[PDB]
Amino acid sequence: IEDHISFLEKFINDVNTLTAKLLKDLQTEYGISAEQSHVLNMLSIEALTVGQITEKQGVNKAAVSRRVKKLLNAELVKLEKIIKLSNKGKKYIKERKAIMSHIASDMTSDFDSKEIEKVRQVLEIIDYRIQSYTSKL
Amino acid sequence: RRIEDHISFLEKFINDVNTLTAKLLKDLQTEYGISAEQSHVLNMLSIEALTVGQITEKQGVNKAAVSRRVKKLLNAELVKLIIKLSNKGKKYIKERKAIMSHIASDMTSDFDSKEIEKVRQVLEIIDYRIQSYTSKL
Ligand SMILES: CC1(C)S[C@@H]2[C@H](NC(=O)Cc3ccccc3)C(=O)N2[C@H]1C(=O)O
Ligand SMILES: CC1(C)S[C@@H]2[C@H](NC(=O)Cc3ccccc3)C(=O)N2[C@H]1C(=O)O
Ligand SMILES: C[As](C)(=O)[O-]
């Protein structure tokens, strides 16, 4: 009931650890922090204003702008002004998706699609509200 | 790509949760004189008293980093060197649970506890498989 909150934190921590482990080599090849790598994955989902990314990243606006500016200096991201992945940022994300999808489908292979669907619906509602809350104060 | 769609959504969901949390806890962190990342090491330590190496490979980050955050926490007296929490660190974690609890609660008080629980059940196995996978590396 609050232990649900604790569990979600444990789960997130573990996902993050797994990702950090599965993406170790790749992020070195590109010389990118998980911090930087995260924004690309973020932009991989859809384009974004530079002001919009600040809102969907939460921490200091200044921290996020520097990271975006840093991904521009590396030419992994490009302009319109909107911010989108460069052809190079795109190749990185394909390799990232390649790995993540590989293990992800290994881990859910005994799951019937309809079990995952219903679980995904409930999380979407929660993702929705999370975003609305985030939108307000 | 069916699954690949589920990872993207999962990636977006986790980023949204982290963004909310950061916004929700910014003042408490500031009141205790710490940064988000320091507060993170603190929540982990609430899970259990871990040593330096443990917190480094878990979060999956470089050398100086973790140690640096831990030196700052021990100078702020929120930790007790192993590395454990202190009455003041324990107080912070408590204040954080309360905030996260009211918020999680008011964002899920219309759900079926049977609905929340089949969801928790599916995620616990995925956490369990993530965890057993991370052992292999
Ligand atoms: C506003 C920020 C969140 S962003 C600013 C800067 N960010 C960096 O990453 C420092 C840096 C610059 C170039 C290369 C490496 C690191 C730095 O450090 N930063 C933060 C601050 O001082 O409040
Ligand atoms: C790998 C991380 C643990 S670092 C990023 C940020 N870190 C934090 O410490 C935020 C935080 C605030 C309060 C309690 C826990 C974590 C946060 O949230 N984080 C995870 C991420 O998605 O990268
Ligand atoms: C101009 As480009 C880095 O999107 O091929």
CB pairs under 8 A between A and B: 138
Which long-range contacts does A20-27 make (Cβ < 8 Å, 24+ apart)?
A20/B59, A20/B60, A20/B61, A21/B60, A21/B134, A21/B137, A22/A99, A22/A100, A22/A103, A23/A96, A23/A99, A24/B60, A26/A92, A26/A95, A26/A96, A26/A99
Taking contacts as CB-CB distances below 8 angstroms, the residues of chain B near A101 are 1, 3-4, 7
Query: Is the beta carbon of A63 within 6 A of some atom in ligand 1?
Result: yes
Q: Which CATH number does A1-137 carry?
A: 1.10.10.10
Q: How was this structure determined?
A: X-ray
Nearest chain A Cα to B116, which residue? A122
Q: Nearest CA of chain B to the CA of A102: how many Å?
A: 9
Strands B79-80 and B84-85: antiparallel
Which residues does a chain break follow in chain B (C to N more than 2.5 Å)? 81
Interchain CB distance below 8 Å, B16 and A127? yes
Q: Nearest CA of chain A to the CA of B3: how many Å?
A: 6
Q: Dihedral sign, CA of A8, A14, A16, A18?
A: negative
Q: Dihedral sign, CA of A65, A67, A69, A75?
A: negative
- Degrees to nearest 5, angle at CA A70 with A25 and A29: 15
- Degrees to nearest 5, angle at CA A43 with A80 and A97: 135
* H/E segment holding residue B62: none
Taking contacts as CB-CB distances below 8 angstroms, the residues of chain B near A17 are 58-60, 134
Report yes or no: B8 and B14 within 8 Å, Cβ to Cβ: no
Indicate which atom in ligand 2 lies nearest the CA of residue B59.
Answer: 1
Distance B104 CA to ligand 2 centre (A): 17
**Number of Cβ atoms within 10 Å of the Cβ of A65:** 15
Q: Where are the domains of chain B?
A: 1-137
* First and final C-alpha spacing in chain B: 24
CA dist., res. A77 & res. B64, Å (int): 28
Query: Is the beta carbon of A84 within 6 A of some atom in ligand 3?
Result: no
